Amino acid sequence: YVDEDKDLTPLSFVSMPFDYYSAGNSFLVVGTNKKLYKLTDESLTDISRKVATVTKKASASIKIYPVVSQIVPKESTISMNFNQTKNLEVSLLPADANNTNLIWEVSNSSYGSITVDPSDSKLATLTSFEKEGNLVVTISTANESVVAQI
Amino acid sequence: NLIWEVSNSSYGSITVDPSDSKLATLTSFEKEGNLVVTISTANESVVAQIAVNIIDGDSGIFLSQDTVTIRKGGTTTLTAVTGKTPVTWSSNNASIVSVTPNANSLTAVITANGEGNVTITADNGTKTASCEIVSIPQIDSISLSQSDVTV
Amino acid sequence: VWRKDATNFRQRVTIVGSFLKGFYQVDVGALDYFYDRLNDVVIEKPLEMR
Amino acid sequence: SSVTLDIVSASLDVGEEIVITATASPEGEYSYQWSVDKTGYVSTTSVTGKSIKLVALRKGEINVTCTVSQMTQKDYDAFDDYPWYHAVISNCAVATTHYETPQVKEFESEYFVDLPGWGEQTVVDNDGNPSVKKFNWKCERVRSFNNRLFALNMREANASGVTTNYPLRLRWSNFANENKAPTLWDDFAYDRVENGYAGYIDLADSNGSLIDILPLKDYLFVYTEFETYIGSPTNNTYQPLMFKKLFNDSGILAPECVVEVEGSHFVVTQNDVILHNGATKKSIASNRVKNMLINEVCLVNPLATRVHLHQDKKEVWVLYVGPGEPKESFACTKA
Amino acid sequence: TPQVKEFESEYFVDLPGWGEQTVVDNDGNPSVKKFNWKCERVRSFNNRLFALNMREANASGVTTNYPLRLRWSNFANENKAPTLWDDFAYDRVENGYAGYIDLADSNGSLIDILPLKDYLFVYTEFETYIGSPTNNTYQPLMFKKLFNDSGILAPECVVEVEGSHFVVTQNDVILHNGATKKSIA
User: Fold this and answer.
1) Pairing of strands E44-45, E29-34
2) In terms of Cα–Cα distance, which of D111, C14, A25 is closest to E107?
3) For residue D60, which of B36, B108, A61 has the smallest C-alpha distance?
4) D65 near D34, Cβ under 8 Å?
5) Are B5 and B40 in contact (CB under 8 A)?
6) Between the CA of residue D169 and those of D139, D153, D196, D204, D328, what are the distances in Å?
7) What is d(CA E25, CA E33) in angstroms, rounded to the nearest whole number?
8) CA-to-CA distance for D309 and D314, rounded, in angstroms?
9) 8 Å CB contact of B34 and D7
10) Residue A109 has what DSSP assignment?
11) SS3 for D89?
């Protein structure tokens, strides 16, 4: 395969067809009295296992906050009907309301001068306008794929 | 019994003195950084680890990586240490490299768009840290097989 | 050779790890490499059938 | 010299990423190998790089570590009479010489490394406190079968390491993985208080030395120069493999004088060639070349006899050393 | 992707459940996620669907090729295709199991596959196999080695003729009824 193998006494070998680093081309894993070599028609390489004379460890801790209760929450007031221009406040809690916040969104934000204002800490208020129709209030989390509906 | 050891024993005139009977005391120095305290046994293969971070004050901040070299399209991460949970980031030349603070707000992901130095920084409100970044192209050099061809 | 006789669709060849410091093909055109201890040299000669 | 990390703790959420960087005190060139205390909970990429990327996957604490190593050159002692055998498993190769470890080569690696778990043995201290320890295990031959790896003539050591040779011991590992080799050889697992069992049988035969091994249509066929055997693998139970005696006179000559041709084996039973499909054997050289092959092979070096399946032309030759050659030579000349 | 076409549909669409993998978070909270799965060949057998040389990705999506991986889906439905490929089901705390075996052979590439009288016959250019499907249990399919030299040439060089297979073993044609092979050329 190369001009370097003509001075070698191999004892055994196997035709490895693939390898992560290698492309879709086969190679050889040949051994000698002391070393193990690899050739792929382009160059020779000694891939003999090397011994570690010195070793040093490094400590590193990691903390993964719980993911339980972060999944889609449940709603107590799944639906709430009010009068024409009533502004009844909203009361609800996500699943344990632990380790994360949420974002209250409402479709067709035209049913009030300020339909839903930014929640002070966790929740916000609701209002109404002098018109009817069907709408949906999506309580979406920060970025995770959790989109509820009221 | 056990033996209390600390890496980089330079954070105090006497960082950890020989434990009187079982335990010893701890001290500090006027500097920040990350270290590890290995509580090793006498000879058996038992090596624990304790991670402590000197906040450099009351609510100071110091980044793990100070200088970074990223290739185009790559990405890295940053780690901060503070006492206050609110950690608002602020990077000059914003629209050359993006940042996305995670939920904890103590970690942020970097995304290289194009070549160009950036000095992404944070701001806790009292103190401030910095992290120099030098974007490098995906290539450093090339080579051919012939230079004196003849046809 | 332009087109050597093949024994496989993928055209795989049987190779040998020889004691003569190199590899060798086992089933190829008429040629035999006989070693000599006198001069310590490799010698090639036609393959002799009997 | 001493190594340190600027990062010691971190808070993550499932779905968030983070990257840590390792930096030793000296600026030299060294090798890295990251480890994890509790399997899972994270995903790694390019563990051999000084910058690893992690991805939170599940709840729970964890303690990551990075092992820096100053690799150096090392010469083996695989003489001509103890060459390599080079089995194959999950596209990964193995070395398996005498006086040394098998030294597998992973599929996603570019260097040879000792087998994982080689020498691991589970120990239980007082009150039932489990622990693992590695001992100096040395083998003579290793092959692949039923997604497992085997071993022959194990020089199993132990505490008080005066080695005791067990020429009839035969261990088998767990099943393979995705583009990786087995990772457990300990027989004393499941002792820490369902599948993936490893063990041995410690055969009882004559002349021992358990030289060779080869599979045949899901049924192993052990050869030790006498008293061949058969391997019956079960799905999963206390006895995963039950070995039953087959012959009393049959037995391979050298460690590589057998090969499958057509649902059978081409063996050399110390006196002639045999071709058995299972439970019945024949003689391919009964009264044609027997006295010729025995004479030509019994002169210089019979143990150098080999075989090869020349499927390219439907031929199975038995290599052996020529008549006139040094008694210390292993270079087969005739076939 | 395989891009199946339903029976009650007039357009092509990706397979359902392709890439689905069950994940369990802290405290045993299950969830499902889809990853970039890419295959090379897909066939039907025992009311199931198979895959060869899967490029199974994951979080931190540096893809790891598993040329010996082989997944199988659940059973079919009324005029529809399978709907579950995840091996990590039944982990949310009886029938319809999917999984893989991660064969161990030489030269890999797991190119071809074909059934024969309820018994699969995997070919990868070397070290053919056989598939034994059970009714329902932990191990629904137990693959046993058959040959050491046999192996198909290309991904579509095999076909059933009469309770046997017409294969090209890199050197000639073979016609095996099962446990015994011949040479037609």
Assistant:
1) unpaired
2) A25
3) A61
4) yes
5) yes
6) 10, 6, 19, 10, 30
7) 12
8) 8
9) yes
10) T
11) strand
Q: Which of B35, B104, B109 has its CB closest to that of D17? A: B109
Task: Please give the full DSSP string across E100-152, using - where no structure is assigned.
Answer: ------SS----EEEEETTEEEEESSSS-EEEEE-SSSS-SEEEEE--SS---
Contact D260 E23 (CB under 8 A): no
Rounded CA-CA distance E182/E185 in Å is 9
- In degrees, rounded to 5, the angle at the alpha carbon of residue E61 between the alpha carbons of residues E14 and D114 is 125
The b/e string for D155-182 (b: 16+ C-beta within 10 A; e otherwise) is bbeeeeeeeeebbbbbbbbbbbebbbbb
Q: In chain A, which residues have their Cβ closer than 8 Å to the Cβ of D55?
A: none
Given CB atoms, is D125 within the 8 Å cutoff of chain B? no
Under 8 Å between Cβ of B31 and B72:
no
- Three-state DSSP at D299 gives coil
Give the pair of three-digit tokens for residue E147.
């040959």
Q: Cα B137 to the chain's mean position, in Å? A: 24
What's the gap between Cα B128 and its chain centre? 15
With CB atoms and an 8 Å threshold, state whether D312 touches C19: no
B67-136 CATH choice from 3.40.1010.10, 3.40.50.150, 2.60.40.1080, 1.10.287.110:
2.60.40.1080
- Does residue E168 contact residue E128 with C-beta atoms inside 8 Å? no
Return the DSSP state at A48. Answer: P
CA distance A1 to chain B (A): 19
Q: Assign residue E179 a region (left: φ > 0; alpha: ψ between -120 and 50; beta: otherwise).
A: left
- The number of residues in chain A equals 150
Whole-angstrom CA distances from D317 to D179, D277, D297 are 34, 19, 14
CA dihedral B87, B91, B96, B101 (to 10 degrees): 0
Experimental technique = cryo-EM
> Which of A123, A137, A146 lies closest to A73, judged by CA?
A146
The 3-state DSSP composition of chain E as helix, strand, coil percent (nearest 5) reads 0, 30, 70
Residue type, E147: F
Entry field: residues in chain D: 335
Resolution (A): 3.8
DSSP D95-115: ---TTS----B-TT-SS--PP
Q: D interface mutation test: which of A8, A53, A56, A145 has the most D CBs within 10 A? A: A56
The closest alpha carbon to E151, from E162, E165, E140, E167, belongs to E167
